[PDB]
Amino acid sequence: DLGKKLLEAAQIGQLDEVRILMANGADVNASDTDGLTPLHLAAASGHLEIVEVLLKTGADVNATDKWGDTPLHLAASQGHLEIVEVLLKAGADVNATDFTGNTPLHLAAYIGHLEIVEVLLKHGADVNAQDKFGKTPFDLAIDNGNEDIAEVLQKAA
Amino acid sequence: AIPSNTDYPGPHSFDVSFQQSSTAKSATWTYSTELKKLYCQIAKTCPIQIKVMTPPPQGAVIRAMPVYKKAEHVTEVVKRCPNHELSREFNEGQIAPPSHLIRVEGNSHAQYVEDPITGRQSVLVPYEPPQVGTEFTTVLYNFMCNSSCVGGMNRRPILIIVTLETRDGQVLGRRCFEARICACPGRDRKADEDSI
Ligand SMILES: [Zn+2]
């Protein structure tokens, strides 16, 4: 199953295998039973060149998995800065909202990726967006002791 | 006989904790204090902090053993799926047997145990006190299969049981946390916390 092989190659960082599978007709938008696509997996793992070649070969920058998360959510949650930048240029919504109300800025602020927080703000990240529990990105930065991020978010309020 | 998961501080006030974030260049792991749940990517370094209030005896060891969380699974031994066991990835010539889910990183005296009666697999390190002027003993763990792996854990949740033991295998202390080996630790932690 070329889809299954492509998902695995994208997750584990096998760039040559990704290129070979797509040349052999692997569905660039294949999904597993959690709705993760090769682009989700490369974005979460941090494989920049794979993310680029998937987007060049027709990967869906807006695809949502079973949590409603886009590849930008996953790169933002992990701290993969160059991937966040490439996804925004390629058409990602900076304020894509998952099924429990997280934006990429919620996840960056919570886990504590300062440089990602700065890049998301420059692309119109919404500081007022509330998750399912009423929490803003600032609320989550305070709750997880990310002081420098809370300061940056307060200045952007 | 099922391994006990009961928390037991014991006479040395044994406790297991996690630093506030990965010192990796990305969220290779993250720990939920709300859910007492570690989230990590496959084979990444996971530092776990051990604290005691009085020195353990000479010869004490720290064991880490994975067990299934749900009563319907707990009798099944937790090991790597065949695909990861037989992969060449991470399986270069080394002390850890390739079936073991839990490895220790950076300790030549880590010992891989398979009980010849129960078939349970675990990994030991000698207990060492903290380096002078630190609070914690750090043990580096690696978790060598995804929670989702169909030939192994197959989306069943696991607990990591951390036991402080005498040389002769008497329990001195025990702490337990849930572990998930997943694609995106940062998202999975928030999603799980959101769900509860
Ligand atoms: Zn596996």
**Contact of B142 with B44, CB cutoff 8 Å:** yes
C-alpha B145 – ligand 1 centre gap (Å): 4
In whole angstroms, what is the distance from residue A76 CA to residue A91 CA?
15
For this PDB entry, the determination method is: X-ray
In whole angstroms, what is the distance from residue A53 CA to residue A56 CA?
5
Resolution value, angstrom units: 1.9
Q: In this structure, what DSSP letter does residue A49 have? A: H
Residue among B25, B26, B44, B146 with most chain A CBs within 10 A, to mutate: B26
In the block, residue with structure tokens 């839990």 = B102
Chain A contact for B184, CB < 8 A? yes
**Contact of B31 with B39, CB cutoff 8 Å:** yes
Q: Which amino acid is at A71?
A: P
Interchain proximity A145–B20, CB inside 8 Å: yes
Q: Which residues contact B72 (CB under 8 A, 6 or more apart)?
A: none
Interchain proximity B190–A77, CB inside 8 Å: yes
Max intra-chain CA distance, chain A:
50
**Contact of B183 with A35, CB cutoff 8 Å:** no
Smallest CA–CA distance, residue A139 to chain B, in Å, is: 13
Q: Which amino acid is at A88?
A: L
B182 labeled binding residue: no
Interchain proximity A74–B187, CB inside 8 Å: yes
C-alpha B143 – ligand 1 centre gap (Å): 10
- Measured between beta carbons, the chain A residues lying within 8 angstroms of B30 are 111
In whole angstroms, what is the distance from residue B30 CA to residue B186 CA?
6
Nearest residue of B to residue A104, measured between CA atoms:
B187
Smallest CA–CA distance, residue A41 to chain B, in Å, is: 7
DSSP class per residue in B110-131: -EEEE-TTT--EEEEEE--PPP
In whole angstroms, what is the distance from residue B136 CA to residue B58 CA?
18
What tokens were used for A119? 């890049």
Q: Angle at CA A156, nearest 5°, toward A154 and A157? A: 65
Chain A contact for B51, CB < 8 A? no
If contacts are CB pairs under 8 Å, which of residues 23-42 in chain B contact chain A?
25-27, 30, 41
Q: Which of A36, A111, A133 sits opposite B186 (nearest CB)?
A: A111
